[PDB]
C-alpha cells in the first residue's frame, strides 16, 4: 500500500462546489442562437431580455441536481442520475442523435456503463465543444470534440476525431481523478495524488503533428483545486500555493505587473487568506476568499471587470494615450455583497450572493446579465430580482458564451420572513 500514504485531495472534499440537496428548478438567460437556451425549436423562445424557468425541465419531473455551463453545450446530471443535453449538436456536443437539439432530453443509461455497475457522476464538464464525466469509481467518461488553435477537429489524438457517442477514457494516472476543469478546448483533470493532468491542446506544453490529445500530465506538485477558464488556467498546491499558467494577453493569470505564461506563477497573498473558489473566461478571471471578499483580474475593454470608471485600481493597464485597457491586479472592492460561489463566461460574470441574490457584472448586450432590454454593458454588478427568482433562493450559477444558466427553488418564509431586511 505505497499509494495509500500519498492521496491529498478527495471526491468528498470537492462535493461543496457541484452537487446540492433539494431538486432545484433550472433557469436560463441571453441569446441562445445555437438552440442552447433549451426553449424548444421556437424562434420566439430564443430571445430573452431577463430570467425564466424551464417548461420541459420541471424541478420535480426531471430532478435537476447538477448542471453544466458552456458556450454551445448545456448539460446536467441528476441524483438518479441522468444525462440531460441542451447544446449545439454539431461537434457531437449533445452526445446523442437528434429541433430536438433545443429540447432538453436525458441521454440513455446504456451509453455509460458505470451507472450499470454502482457509481454516479461527480461533476459535468463542458468545454467549447468537449464533454467528459469524472465518474466516482475512477474512470472518466467523454463526449464531443475540441476546436483547435488552427481550427479543426480532434477527439483522441488520431484514433478519434468527433466523439458524439459517449465513451469512457482509458487509464491516465493510477490515482483516481478527483475533480475536473472546463473552458476552451482545454480539459485539465486532477489526480488523487495531486498530479495536474491535461488533455486537448492547452495552447494559449508545446508540440506539433498531433499525438498530444489523449494524454495526460504534467506540471504542478500536489494541487487541490484545478480551476480552468477559457484561455486562462488556475492551480493551487496543497502547500498553500497560488499558480496560473495560460494566455496572459490581458493579465488573465494575475502574475504580471506589466500587461504568455511559460511556467506557472500567479498570486501574492498578504498576511493570510483561504480561496473558497475560483473561475474565469477568455479575458475575465476571478477567485473568491473564505471570508467573503473577492479577488478577480481581467481586461477593462469589454467591461469584463465590474469596476465602473470611478473604482479603477492604481496597478491597471492603459492604452498609449487612451482609455483603461486591463486590470491584472486582484481585488474584491468595498461596495460588494457576501458572494458565496461563482460562475464565468467570455465576459459575462454571473456571481451568486449569500442570500441567493444575482449580480451580473459583465457584457449584457446579448442579455447574458439578464436585466431586461438594454444594449449597454454592466459596468458593475446588477442586483437581479424579477417575478420568477426574486424570492427564489439561487443555488448553482453558470455562464457560457452568450448565456447564463440560472436555477434553484422557490423560497419560503425563511427567505422573505428572515431576509425581509432592506
Amino acid at each position: 500500500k505505497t499509494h495509500a500514504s500519498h492521496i491529498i485531495n478527495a471526491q468528498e472534499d470537492y462535493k461543496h462546489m457541484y452537487l446540492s440537496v433539494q431538486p432545484l428548478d433550472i433557469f436560463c438567460w441571453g441569446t441562445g442562437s445555437m438552440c442552447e437556451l433549451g426553449l424548444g425549436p421556437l424562434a420566439k423562445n430564443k430571445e430573452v431580455k431577463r430570467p425564466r424557468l424551464n417548461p420541459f425541465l420541471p424541478r420535480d419531473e426531471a430532478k435537476i441536481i447538477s448542471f453544466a455551463v458552456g458556450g454551445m453545450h448545456t448539460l446536467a446530471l441528476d441524483e438518479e442520475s441522468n444525462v440531460w443535453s441542451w447544446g449545439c449538436n454539431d461537434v457531437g456536443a449533445l452526445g446523442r442523435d437528434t429541433e430536438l437539439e433545443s429540447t432538453p432530453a436525458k441521454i440513455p443509461r446504456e451509453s455509460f456503463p458505470p451507472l450499470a455497475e454502482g457509481h454516479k457522476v461527480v461533476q459535468l464538464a463542458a468545454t467549447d465543444n468537449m464533454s467528459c464525466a469524472l465518474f466516482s469509481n475512477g474512470e472518466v467518461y467523454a463526449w464531443g470534440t475540441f476546436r483547435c488553435n488552427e481550427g479543426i477537429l480532434g477527439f483522441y489524438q488520431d484514433k478519434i476525431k468527433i466523439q458524439k457517442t459517449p465513451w469512457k477514457v482509458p487509464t491516465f494516472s493510477k490515482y483516481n481523478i478527483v475533480q475536473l476543469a472546463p473552458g476552451k478546448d482545454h480539459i485539465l483533470f486532477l489526480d488523487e495524488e495531486g498530479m495536474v493532468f491535461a488533455w486537448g491542446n492547452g495552447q494559449q506544453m508545446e508540440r506539433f503533428r498531433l499525438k498530444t490529445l489523449d494524454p495526460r500530465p504534467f506540471g504542478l506538485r500536489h494541487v487541490k483545486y484545478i480551476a480552468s477558464g477559457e484561455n486562462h488556467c488556475f492551480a493551487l498546491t496543497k502547500d498553500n500555493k497560488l499558480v496560473s499558467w495560460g494566455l496572459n494577453q490581458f493579465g488573465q493569470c494575475g502574475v504580471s505587473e506589466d500587461v504568455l505564461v511559460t511556467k506557472p506563477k500567479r498570486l501574492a497573498l498578504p498576511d493570510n487568506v483561504v480561496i473558497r473558489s475560483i473561475a474565469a473566461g477568455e479575458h475575465h478571471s476571478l477567485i473568491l476568499s473564505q471570508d467573503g471578499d473577492l479577488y478577480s483580474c481581467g481586461r477593462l475593454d469589454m467591461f469584463e471587470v465590474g469596476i465602473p470608471k470611478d473604482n479603477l485600481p492604481e496597478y491597471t493597464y492603459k492604452d498609449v494615450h487612451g482609455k483603461a485597457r486591463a486590470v491584472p491586479l486582484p481585488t474584491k472592492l468595498n461596495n460588494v455583497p457576501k458572494f458565496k460561489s461563482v460562475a464565468a463566461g467570455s465576459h459575462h460574470s454571473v456571481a451568486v450572493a449569500q442570500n441567493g441574490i444575482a449580480y451580473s457584472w459583465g457584457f449584457g448586450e446579448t442579455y447574458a446579465v439578464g436585466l431586461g432590454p438594454f444594449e449597454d454593458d454592466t459596468e458593475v454588478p446588477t442586483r437581479i430580482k424579477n417575478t420568477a427568482t426574486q424570492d427564489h433562493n439561487i443555488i448553482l450559477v453558470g455562464c457560457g458564451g452568450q448565456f447564463s444558466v440560472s436555477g434553484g427553488v422557490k423560497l419560503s418564509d425563511e427567505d422573505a420572513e428572515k431576509r425581509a431586511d432592506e
Binding site: 506544453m205 508545446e206 508540440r207 506539433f208 504534467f218 511559460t262 511556467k263
Partner: protein, 95 residues
C-alpha cells in the same frame, strides 16, 4: 580554466518548453550537443558553398534557409522552414 561554451544550458532550456518534467542523461546531454554540432555544421556549408556557386560574399538568410530546405528532410523542412519564417518575421518586428 578555458570557458567551454556548451549548448548545455540552451539544450536544457528548449527541453522545458517541449516537456517540463524532466529529463535527460549525461551521455545523452552530450548527444544533444552533437545534434546541434552536425546541423550547425552541415547547414553552414550548403550555406557557404551556396554563396560561392551564387557569387555573393555574405551569407544572408537568402542562403541559410535555401540550404535549410535543401538540407532538411521533406515534412520537417517545411516545418522549420515555417519556424524560421516565424523567427524571421519576429526579428524584423522588434523595437
Amino acid at each position: 580554466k578555458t570557458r567551454k561554451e556548451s549548448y548545455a544550458i540552451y539544450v536544457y532550456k528548449v527541453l522545458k518548453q517541449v516537456h517540463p518534467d524532466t529529463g535527460i542523461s549525461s551521455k545523452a546531454m552530450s548527444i544533444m550537443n552533437s545534434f546541434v554540432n552536425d546541423v550547425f555544421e552541415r547547414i553552414a556549408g550548403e550555406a557557404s558553398r551556396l554563396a560561392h556557386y551564387n557569387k555573393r560574399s555574405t551569407i544572408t538568410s537568402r542562403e541559410i534557409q535555401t540550404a535549410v530546405r535543401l538540407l532538411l528532410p521533406g515534412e520537417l523542412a517545411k516545418h522549420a522552414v515555417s519556424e524560421g519564417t516565424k523567427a524571421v518575421t519576429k526579428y524584423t518586428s522588434a523595437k
